[PDB]
Amino acid sequence: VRLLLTSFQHPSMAQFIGGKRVAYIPDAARSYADAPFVQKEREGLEKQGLELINLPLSHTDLAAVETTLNAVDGVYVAGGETFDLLQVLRSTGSDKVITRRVRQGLPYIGCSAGSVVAGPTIEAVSLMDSPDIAPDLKDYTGLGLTELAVIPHASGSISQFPIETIADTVRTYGERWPLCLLRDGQALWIEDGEVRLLNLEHH
Amino acid sequence: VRLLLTSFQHPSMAQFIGGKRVAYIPDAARSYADAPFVQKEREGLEKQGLELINLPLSHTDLAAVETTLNAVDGVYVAGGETFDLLQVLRSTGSDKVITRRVRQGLPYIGCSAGSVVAGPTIEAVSLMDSPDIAPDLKDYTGLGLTELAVIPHASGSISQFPIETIADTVRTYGERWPLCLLRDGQALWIEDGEVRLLNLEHH
């Protein structure tokens, strides 16, 4: 079981995958699909020599979700609106498909919202991403691929998520949940239980 | 270079040292040396089969600090008042002695205040430990054995350091310093650059 949970990507993503073909799951950002600078995430992976296989879960039946995830060397779950991404994952039902494939050894890279849904819950980022985008979302449980609750952009370097609200997130969820503050540039390299916390320079 | 930085100890401390003899540096808690439950830290290491060599830096000339640190399998820097511990380390001058010995491969275990002084600064815990205990302490720079700024007891489970002030610490120091929230039971196993974040169960 291999996870690479980044706040906003990491230079060793390509080495983590160990291959060239990565399924790119964009649904977290479907709410502004063709908005300027939404492609910056795909350029980061492409700049490292990865060829991306787009896999929009909202527009794919689960049989084809299964077929792509068995023809790729890894899967990448892009950032965006965390609550809408879990709405997709639970409604589509690919939450079971992706989780099953990840546990069989398919390496999983998370970025922002992709890193949070890998953990036990998305409730700890409700001061970061709006929960109102999924008003019919009852259960906030994540995929459970990791027990660590990633809080991305922990430096306060994004205007939508300033250090005041990251602090509010710690005040609100720090007691029950094992919060992990990730700054942009950092990533969690998780491999068969061992959790390595990497900075930018670790490659 | 081997560090094990715990919030409040970790079950694998003995395995980290790889030997039986550990120099126990108690000065962070000299301000209440014989106070009830101050010995709980020494029992934790002793319960794991470690024989502790007490090394109070306030009462030891640097030549003997050097001699003990060369006859032990590792060094343990106990919790207490972070600002008084750095006052000791800088005034005694053992900050250079310990740092030199750690870089030569002497394994270093930090607990609370011992884990914070290993990093770049102690200023990020000034809402946790009082800086007034060292009014003549000019420079807040740490030992620099790690670049990660450990914030211990991050769960808010200690009455003196509730989740509100850990949140205030993130609001106050989160932008400049690479804050690492450690909950009691967690520890950072750092070995030749690689930083592993361990939970209680990782042993």
Curated annotation (Swiss-Prot), chains A, B:
<dbReference type="InterPro" id="IPR005320">
    <property type="entry name" value="Peptidase_S51"/>
</dbReference>
<feature type="active site" description="Charge relay system">
    <location>
        <position position="153"/>
    </location>
</feature>
<dbReference type="Pfam" id="PF03575">
    <property type="entry name" value="Peptidase_S51"/>
</dbReference>
<comment type="similarity">
    <text>Belongs to the peptidase S51 family.</text>
</comment>
<feature type="active site" description="Charge relay system">
    <location>
        <position position="112"/>
    </location>
</feature>
<protein>
    <recommendedName>
        <fullName>Uncharacterized peptidase DR_1070</fullName>
        <ecNumber>3.4.21.-</ecNumber>
    </recommendedName>
</protein>
<keyword id="KW-0378">Hydrolase</keyword>
<keyword id="KW-0720">Serine protease</keyword>
<dbReference type="GO" id="GO:0006508">
    <property type="term" value="P:proteolysis"/>
</dbReference>
<keyword id="KW-0645">Protease</keyword>
<dbReference type="InterPro" id="IPR029062">
    <property type="entry name" value="Class_I_gatase-like"/>
</dbReference>
<dbReference type="GO" id="GO:0008236">
    <property type="term" value="F:serine-type peptidase activity"/>
</dbReference>
